[PDB]
Design an enzyme around this catalytic site. Structure first.
Site, PDB file in Angstrom:
ATOM      1  CB  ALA D  12      50.492  53.900 -18.656  1.00 42.08           C
ATOM      2  CD  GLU D  62      54.401  45.326 -13.831  1.00 47.31           C
ATOM      3  OE1 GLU D  62      54.995  44.259 -14.091  1.00 47.31           O
ATOM      4  OE2 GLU D  62      53.895  46.057 -14.709  1.00 47.31           O
ATOM      5  CB  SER D 131      47.058  52.940 -19.473  1.00 42.40           C
ATOM      6  OG  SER D 131      47.390  51.774 -18.744  1.00 42.40           O
ATOM      7  N   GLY D 137      46.006  49.647 -14.225  1.00 45.06           N
ATOM      8  CA  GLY D 137      45.557  50.998 -14.504  1.00 45.06           C
ATOM      9  C   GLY D 137      44.098  51.119 -14.882  1.00 45.06           C
ATOM     10  CB  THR D 170      51.007  47.252 -26.445  1.00 43.62           C
ATOM     11  OG1 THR D 170      50.269  47.646 -25.283  1.00 43.62           O
ATOM     12  CG2 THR D 170      51.581  48.488 -27.107  1.00 43.62           C
ATOM     13  CG  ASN D 197      50.222  55.654 -26.217  1.00 41.26           C
ATOM     14  OD1 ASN D 197      50.310  56.713 -25.600  1.00 41.26           O
ATOM     15  ND2 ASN D 197      50.376  54.474 -25.634  1.00 41.26           N
ATOM     16  CD  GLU D 245      38.193  80.756 -11.928  1.00 42.13           C
ATOM     17  OE1 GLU D 245      38.177  81.278 -13.062  1.00 42.13           O
ATOM     18  OE2 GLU D 245      38.563  81.365 -10.902  1.00 42.13           O
TER      19      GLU D 245
HETATM   20  N1  GTP Z   1      51.752  57.014 -23.270  1.00 40.06           N
HETATM   21  C1  GTP Z   1      52.198  55.903 -22.569  1.00 40.06           C
HETATM   22  N2  GTP Z   1      51.450  54.800 -22.649  1.00 40.06           N
HETATM   23  C2  GTP Z   1      52.018  53.775 -21.902  1.00 40.06           C
HETATM   24  C3  GTP Z   1      53.200  53.839 -21.157  1.00 40.06           C
HETATM   25  N3  GTP Z   1      53.473  52.625 -20.532  1.00 40.06           N
HETATM   26  C4  GTP Z   1      52.459  51.816 -20.894  1.00 40.06           C
HETATM   27  N4  GTP Z   1      51.557  52.503 -21.733  1.00 40.06           N
HETATM   28  C5  GTP Z   1      50.336  52.036 -22.351  1.00 40.06           C
HETATM   29  O1  GTP Z   1      49.484  51.622 -21.337  1.00 40.06           O
HETATM   30  C6  GTP Z   1      48.883  50.399 -21.715  1.00 40.06           C
HETATM   31  C7  GTP Z   1      49.384  49.215 -20.843  1.00 40.06           C
HETATM   32  O2  GTP Z   1      49.092  49.516 -19.564  1.00 40.06           O
HETATM   33  P1  GTP Z   1      50.380  49.228 -18.308  1.00 40.06           P
HETATM   34  O3  GTP Z   1      50.515  50.652 -17.854  1.00 40.06           O
HETATM   35  O4  GTP Z   1      51.337  48.631 -19.285  1.00 40.06           O
HETATM   36  O5  GTP Z   1      49.420  48.353 -17.491  1.00 40.06           O
HETATM   37  P2  GTP Z   1      49.276  48.352 -15.838  1.00 40.06           P
HETATM   38  O6  GTP Z   1      48.355  49.533 -15.845  1.00 40.06           O
HETATM   39  O7  GTP Z   1      50.682  48.491 -15.324  1.00 40.06           O
HETATM   40  O8  GTP Z   1      48.622  46.979 -15.616  1.00 40.06           O
HETATM   41  P3  GTP Z   1      49.221  45.411 -15.479  1.00 40.06           P
HETATM   42  O9  GTP Z   1      50.551  45.560 -16.190  1.00 40.06           O
HETATM   43  O10 GTP Z   1      48.233  44.509 -16.190  1.00 40.06           O
HETATM   44  O11 GTP Z   1      49.354  45.184 -13.990  1.00 40.06           O
HETATM   45  C8  GTP Z   1      49.314  50.145 -23.165  1.00 40.06           C
HETATM   46  O12 GTP Z   1      48.404  50.875 -23.932  1.00 40.06           O
HETATM   47  C9  GTP Z   1      50.683  50.820 -23.234  1.00 40.06           C
HETATM   48  O13 GTP Z   1      50.967  51.227 -24.534  1.00 40.06           O
HETATM   49  C10 GTP Z   1      53.939  55.013 -21.107  1.00 40.06           C
HETATM   50  O14 GTP Z   1      54.994  55.274 -20.520  1.00 40.06           O
HETATM   51  N5  GTP Z   1      53.387  56.076 -21.860  1.00 40.06           N
HETATM   52 MG    MG Z   2      51.930  46.795 -15.282  1.00 38.50          MG
END
Ligand code: GTP
Ligand code: MG
Ligand code: GTP
Ligand code: MG
Ligand code: MG
Ligand code: MG
Lengths: 427, 264, 430, 430, 427
Positions: D12, D62, D131, D137, D170, D197, D245
């Protein structure tokens, strides 16, 4: 400049050396008529290590053909690459040793060893800076066993400062050819303890295992068996003949693999070894040569190195390679298999890299391993010797040639001493 | 008649045979021939033939009925058991490497009864018996089954009073370097329970090194190996205190502090 | 004047010399046949009309690498009696290279070095290139530096040695040879730069993005380091550092002459475009442990004195800002008896790049040379390996059979421990 | 000066950063290869001649999305050691991203962040994109933030988080990950903006009339929001709002730092021509609950402080009229202890439009940023989900088996409940 | 990078593996000669997860082919895409298990598993960063059921941190092909529950049901049955091989799908599955795929999900797809069928979306469901086992090869315990 005098004893030694001279002549671009027909200029820079110069741009091998049977001389001469050898170097008897170590060493070999000494002296002062000798023979017979032993003794009396190499074929009880293997083998290992600087223990059982399991060859012959030994013999002396990033001659291998003077019995190996159907499914890289070399199924002695400890291992790489990849591979095999390496020798591996690969391959390597699993090969010969010697079987053939009973007991005794020394350093 | 034959000065004869390198020492990984016909040679004058030709028979039913025959004769014939204890544990090491589990469970039941009887008779198991049996037992302590696990745990528990704990510490420590992950985990918890049962003097050769090789398994890829290693560290921690750190990274270390603070 | 004579001993020394002299030929515009289509006099001699011959000697007891030079691209550059060749190599034996085989060559190479030194009127010193694990590069180098010290005396002798690594080792008897050559390079050298092959492998793999480096890249980096050493003599800048000036500002005690080389920036061509390689960034990158040419951690040691050798578009003001930022940074600590431990020299000419080389063309470069106490841990692990291998008397019969006593092993180990004791004694504060 | 460093963690974060950096490149006129055919210094570093490199670090355990960046259009913009990959992803596990997998990569991430912050001289703070629901994340972001807090101290750590929806989620173990990352971003973040989202989906379908939006449009709106955050640093206007600020005027108590993001006008191209987008109209549309970027109702909450970031053809007089009209609305109620809660910044630079984007070109734009008590409802429902999935101890064995213990689950739950309690404590009148 | 080692056991496992490698090579553009002939660069970007590089631009599968019959090895090698497999990876016996779990697990697979383990170790240290293993086998036989389970144990004792994936073809009473299916299935299920990270329950009855009523295939063979399974196995590992909007590897599905460690038996499904006549009358939209993949008709196990509750559901999507439409379809499925989803897990369904669809399809979906209705498949095997075991039928085959009645008793006991665990979590 660092010339090598090659000696061939017995039928097995003559055939292995004939295949060896064929593969060296293929490596240096020498035709079966003895003239140079190669393409690279590196093939002629170190032509003198194995070949003498004759009139007419013709190179003759520095080889000595020894047997007690003239039939082997006829077979070597009439075969391929048989017209390049000097006819004055074909030294033969007429009777044959009769699978008798006593006849090959004392009563029949004494008259012929003087002629062999004259020929090897003529080759010794024929060359500029001799560094050592190579003798190919087998320890199951009488000519390979008896003549070769007495020859080694006389040469070490005459040239004590040169490097003695023997590519000796061991007898194994599984693929057993003759009955008197233990007597000849014991009486020969006796004298190869104190008179050879390094000994390459080769077993026909392991070669048959390669040809069956690794090469998938449905009908191996002695030619296919001798090709492996010839590849090893060419791989050992590669850095003498061709330039490389990290050179290592015979004396350097002897320094780096003989920590104590009685421990110079090695397990040779070669890599890569491919089947015809399995060649397309392999990516010719350094790490797979590293894992193939240290595999137990690849060894050319019928010993399992996992039963003991590697004292020192050598690795003579050929071809264009990265030194970093080679060094990290030989670090990885030491770290992953630390229970198979001796602990009071840090960095058991000697590494050598040559720029010129063998013909038909773009990279290759030769494995030479000083392991404590050599004693397993000598346990078998010792127990087979004891079985025949407790009931005094076949002694009348050896005693009738002037040999006393004390030569057998003494040879079995310091064979047991060599075994106990390897067991001591195995811990 | 009695199934055993007491050989006068037989065990010590075998011992001086093996120290002087006349028979092959027990140190191997896979079973071979020469070892087993060795046992046919020095096993012969000790136990009678009608049990010999059935303890070395290919079929397992003959094996299990032979070991049962030894089981009714365990209490009544204990002196013959003591006289050739090395050879019966020696053949116990052979019935470990086969895949049949009925023979395993029957043997380990007999092992349980055997170390009970050796406990009550105050026999001290010797050095060569330990070096020939214990490291070969340390791979029967890592099976996926649930009753062989607990009963070989009982074997290694009830062996503690007939052999010194300092020497068995090394053999249970030696098993922590093989590839079977479960047996590393259970050997680390075994190290933990031997530390809390005999103190700090049990670890060999020095405390500092032993605390170091029971610390590298915290960085193991396995999860229960790591959990058992951390459990061993907090077990020696709760008995001895803050000097375990000097006896003993960036990832394993912080997990060690958080485990000892949540446990303490 | 201001001439230097390079000595290359063993396979490692000869190959490093090949890379070095390629670099000097491109730096001075000299074609590989000695022609050029002044400032070259430091390394090259003028012969007749338009012929420049290197002031170098190539010594090896085996004829392999020397004949590679004699049939290579640079076969016209050297004249054949600068390339002295033996017959049998030392075979990783210190005793063979020192007593048995080295005695038949040492008189010839001393005669050649005497004729080479008679050519120059302003000899600054000698540059020695060899390896420690090799038989020739330890034994014959020890013999040669003994003879050089007794013949010349007060002339400076700088050596560049390939130290064995903690883990990456190619020979078995490397600890023996390395200990025995340290025993003599304590007293017969004036400044010894240590280079570790594993560190160069790590530097190449990480910085230069080379998956599979070989000895050629290693020798190119070493040649760049030596070029940064001698560019102060060869070219003129804002601040110039002579070799005597270098030793005066880097060596605090006569037994402490083992600085640590590093080079910045080592980068690739595609990574060059994204970095604004200022003076401050490369100065900070020199003090990073990952860029050290020896596998050791400077955080566990203390810097005694360090020499900064900038070349290219470098001004003194941001250099001084870089030393200021290094002084403010806590993780680099200096010994309390050296309130200022920075020797700075700026050369005007940027370093030249070689075709087929992996180093990108840069505006600025720097070779920082630090005398620190962190070198003693590589010494400690070498002593550990030596003690492990000497407890069982392994491989000693090879040395004894070639005219050597065990007392030499014992005294080499004792003097090596004395050197470590001196380093830890000067490490502590007061 | 006035630099900031963007950090993108997880899929994300990386996919939001792709849209963010294409938007910054379009805003500053930088081509995707780095060339500019001043004011870019906030996000870009100028290297050599005609090359601007982003002041960003892309981290994921990854390599898939990072390999999309490396093989995409923006290959030449980033240099490869700003794009850091692991081997195995955290697999929706906080424990994997925090302890087991994130610890072998955190050191190199810190090294690259230190090298990136050394070349900047006026660092305002860090921007963190991640995220809450993902394993990487959440866990690696928590580890990176708790390490950055002690490495840098008082630097502002602003973060933009993808908060999971009440209905649209998701993954299954997202409540665990979100709780165990809010337990650390409570004390390691200076200001945290939540993004839902589902709310972006509703905004897209209603405003932009997009039947089937995807993650790309979501990241475009998020990039527009962050551009509106940093436009005061990047450009100049009548009233400028720095990050300090911003934090002073938005954060009344150190635990109360979770404002709501809004953006206006969010419109389509065919709907742009009919609407007279006056300042008052988009200001009113900022406070309308269906334009909130988080699914929550501000009517049942109370406003504490709201920051108004205007950009474009905006004058202060109708801005002041807009706050007057907002204050006379009775449905928008503020707390009694904040008589004025409007921090207004007017910027001259109009918002750029990305080619292929869904947003129309507008003269004016507002990013209203309100600290309100209505954000606790989303926390309440996610805590309901966490309590439901924790009562049966479902999925706990994955977290326990990766080095973390059940006490962390507990203490995170009471920590999060205490945060809610603080929110209704500061929401009540006196 | 995140390599997967594939293992095939038994005839059914070897045939499904052959079809799987065929469809994988079709997805990555690998010809039957092993050379890349694709068009997109994405096909080579993650080629290493299933293929090893060879010389001359050749890719060999990272597959180990295991059977106790050489006839299946000959049939696989003689078939299409049979020339890509490494000949050293063909590990075969000569006797056959004889539908005996004892012969597979204790008697013949016991000595052949050492060679299998050697090949697996070779493939494990040949790859850079291993993540897990894939075994395809059946539970009704003796080779895949007995030896494959023993093989699973031997990897899991050695590589315990990796993902154990099994696509296990369970027996069903309707298409019941042998007599001793209950014995082998019951003895194999017990070691699957502690040694597999996740297990996909394939049933031939459900496969025939899909080929009959869904695809309208008038004469499905075993190839048409294995094509569905191969599409499922390719569907699971898609996010490892191709980029997507939302990536999810094997460990991500294992974390999101296994709430308690013994509940990892999944019924899989594939969408879309259209007849040739009915293909042109269908809309290729996300709601159509969502409606198909959640239907009880589309399940590949003989279990009705309406008879239990979904614990967790994995939905793997392929193709250029909108995230909002996918998420709102998942939410509508969970809202409308709330009685079929368990209540203490909010949002039971996991979503993952990949950009690259299968060949000849605009978009595709893969269903992986962890339902409590999977206990019915175990209850049927349990009652069939109890009927056979109450009268001690066919036990002399198992007892005579080394087994005993006792481990039959524990196997029934803990498989009933697994049924009870699924029942208590059904509520
Ligand atoms: N707004 C938005 N949400 C995203 C996006 N890609 C993933 N997400 C959200 O982020 C969450 C999943 O986190 P990833 O970003 O998929 O997880 P990671 O942080 O890569 O972690 P691992 O995959 O477990 O190593 C879910 O809520 C997805 O819907 C994106 O491009 N935009
Ligand atoms: Mg990931
Ligand atoms: N960096 C580097 N190290 C080298 C090079 N060539 C050899 N070495 C190292 O030097 C050591 C071996 O010493 P050589 O220089 O090979 O030995 P020698 O000095 O020729 O000695 P002998 O051959 O025994 O007469 C090992 O550490 C090799 O890795 C080279 O070109 N570069
Ligand atoms: Mg003969
Ligand atoms: Mg040399
Ligand atoms: Mg079958």
């Amino acid at each position: 400049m660092r010339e090598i005098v090659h000696i061939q004893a017995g039928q097995c030694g003559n055939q292995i050396g004939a295949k060896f001279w064929e593969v060296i002549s293929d490596e240096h671009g020498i035709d079966p008529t003895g003239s140079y027909h190669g393409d690279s200029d590196l093939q002629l820079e170190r032509i003198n290590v194995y070949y003498n110069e004759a009139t007419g741009n013709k190179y003759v091998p520095r080889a000595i053909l020894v047997d007690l049977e003239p039939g082997t001389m006829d077979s070597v001469r009439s075969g391929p690459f048989g017209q390049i050898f000097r006819p004055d170097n074909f030294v033969f008897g007429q009777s044959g040793a009769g699978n008798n170590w006593a006849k090959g060493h004392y009563t029949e070999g004494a008259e012929l060893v003087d002629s062999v000494l004259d020929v090897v002296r003529k080759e010794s002062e024929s060359c500029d800076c001799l560094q050592g000798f190579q003798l190919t023979h087998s320890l199951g017979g009488g000519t390979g066993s008896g003549m070769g032993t007495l020859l080694i003794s006389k040469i070490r009396e005459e040239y004590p400062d040169r490097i003695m190499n023997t590519f000796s074929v061991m007898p194994s009880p599984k693929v057993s050819d003759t009955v008197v293997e233990p007597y000849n083998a014991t009486l020969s290992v006796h004298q190869l303890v104190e008179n050879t600087d390094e000994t390459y223990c080769i077993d026909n059982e392991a070669l048959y295992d390669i040809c069956f399991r690794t090469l998938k060859l449905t009908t191996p012959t002695y030619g296919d068996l001798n090709h492996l030994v010839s590849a090893t013999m060419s791989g050992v002396t590669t850095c003498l003949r061709f330039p490389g990033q990290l050179n290592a001659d015979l004396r350097k291998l002897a320094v780096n693999m003989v920590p104590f003077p009685r421990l110079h019995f090695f397990m040779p190996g070669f890599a890569p070894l491919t089947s015809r159907g399995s060649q397309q499914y392999r990516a010719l890289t350094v790490p797979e040569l590293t894992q193939q070399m240290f595999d137990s199924k690849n060894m050319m002695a019928a010993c399992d190195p996992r039963h003991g400890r590697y004292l020192t291992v050598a690795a003579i790489f050929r071809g264009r390679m990265s030194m970093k990849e080679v060094d990290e591979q030989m670090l990885n095999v030491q770290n992953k298999n630390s229970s198979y390496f001796v602990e009071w020798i840090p960095n058991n591996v000697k590494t050598a890299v040559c720029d010129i690969p063998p013909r038909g391959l773009k990279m290759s390597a030769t494995f030479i391993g000083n392991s404590t699993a050599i004693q397993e090969l000598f346990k078998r010969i010792s127990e087979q010797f004891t079985a025949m010697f407790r009931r005094k079987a076949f002694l009348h053939w050896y005693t009738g040639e002037g040999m006393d009973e004390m030569e057998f007991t003494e040879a079995e005794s310091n064979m047991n001493d060599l075994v106990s020394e390897y067991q001591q350093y195995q811990d | 008649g009695p199934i055993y034959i007491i050989v006068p000065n037989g065990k010590e004869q075998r011992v001086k045979d093996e120290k002087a390198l006349k028979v092959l020492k027990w140190n191997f990984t896979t079973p071979r021939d020469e070892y087993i016909e060795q046992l046919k040679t020095q096993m012969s004058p000790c136990i009678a033939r009608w049990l010999q030709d059935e303890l070395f028979h290919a079929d397992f039913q003959r094996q299990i009925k032979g070991l049962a025959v030894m089981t009714e004769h365990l209490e009544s014939e204990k002196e013959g058991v003591i006289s050739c204890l090395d050879l019966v544990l020696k053949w116990f090491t052979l019935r470990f490497f086969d895949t049949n589990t009925s023979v395993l469970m029957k043997c380990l039941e007999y092992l349980k009864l055997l170390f009970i009887m050796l406990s009550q008779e105050e026999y001290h198991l010797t050095e060569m018996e330990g070096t020939s049996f214990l490291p070969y037992l340390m791979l029967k302590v890592g099976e996926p089954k649930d009753i062989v696990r607990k009963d070989v745990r009982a074997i290694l528990t009830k062996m503690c009073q007939v052999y010194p704990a300092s020497k068995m510490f090394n053999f249970v420590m030696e098993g922590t370097k093989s590839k079977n992950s479960k047996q590393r985990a259970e050997c680390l918890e075994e190290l933990g329970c031997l530390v809390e049962s005999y103190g700090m003097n049990v670890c060999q050769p020095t405390p500092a090194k032993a605390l170091k090789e029971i610390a590298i398994h915290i960085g193991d890829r396995d999860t229960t190996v790591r959990n058992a290693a951390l459990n061993t560290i907090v077990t020696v921690y709760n008995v001895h205190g803050e000097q375990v750190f000097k006896l003993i990274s960036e990832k394993d270390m912080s997990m060690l502090e958080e485990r000892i603070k949540r446990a303490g | 004047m201001r001439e230097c004579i390079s000595i290359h001993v063993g396979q490692a020394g000869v190959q490093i010399g090949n890379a070095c002299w390629e670099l000097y030929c491109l730096e001075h515009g000299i074609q590989p046949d000695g022609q050029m289509p002044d400032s070259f006099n430091t390394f090259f001699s003028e012969t007749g009309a338009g012929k420049h011959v290197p002031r170098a000697v190539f010594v090896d007891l085996e004829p392999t690498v020397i004949d590679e030079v004699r049939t290579g691209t640079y076969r016209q550059l050297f004249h054949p009696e600068q390339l002295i060749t033996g017959k049998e190599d030392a075979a990783n034996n210190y005793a063979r290279g020192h007593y048995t085989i080295g005695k038949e060559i040492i008189d010839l190479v001393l005669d050649r070095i005497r004729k080479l030194a008679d050519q120059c009127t302003g000899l600054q010193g000698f540059l020695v290139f060899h390896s420690f694990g090799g038989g020739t590069g330890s034994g014959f180098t020890s013999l040669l530096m003994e003879r050089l010290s007794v013949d010349y005396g007060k002339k400076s002798k700088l050596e560049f040695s390939i130290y064995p690594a903690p883990q990456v080792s190619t020979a078995v008897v490397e600890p023996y040879n390395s200990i025995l050559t340290t025993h003599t390079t304590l007293e017969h050298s004036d400044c010894a730069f240590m280079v570790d092959n594993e560190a160069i492998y790590d530097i190449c793999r990480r910085n230069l993005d080379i998956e599979r480096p070989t000895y050629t890249n290693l020798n190119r980096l070493i040649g760049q380091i030596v070029s940064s050493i001698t560019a102060s003599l060869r070219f003129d800048g804002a601040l110039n550092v002579d070799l005597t000036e270098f030793q005066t500002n880097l060596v605090p005690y006569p037994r402490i002459h083992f600085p640590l080389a590093t080079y910045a920036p080592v980068i690739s061509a595609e990574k060059a475009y994204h970095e604004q390689l200022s003076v401050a960034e490369i100065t900070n990158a020199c003090f990073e442990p990952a860029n050290q040419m020896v596998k050791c951690d400077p955080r566990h040691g203390k810097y005694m004195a360090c020499c900064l050798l900038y070349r290219g578009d470098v001004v003194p003001k941001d250099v001084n800002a870089a030393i200021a930022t290094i002084k403010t940074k806590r993780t680099i600590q200096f010994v309390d008896w050296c309130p200022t431990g920075f020797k700075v020299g700026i050369n005007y000419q940027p370093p030249t790049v070689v075709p087929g080389g992996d180093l990108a063309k840069v505006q600025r470069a720097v070779c920082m040379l630090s005398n620190t106490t962190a070198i003693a841990e590589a010494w400690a692990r070498l002593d550990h390996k030596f003690d492990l291998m000497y407890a069982k008397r392994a491989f000693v019969h090879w040395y004894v059979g070639e005219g050597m006593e065990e007392g030499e092993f014992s005294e080499a180990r004792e003097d090596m421990a004395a050197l470590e004791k001196d380093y830890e004694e000067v490490g502590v504060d007061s």
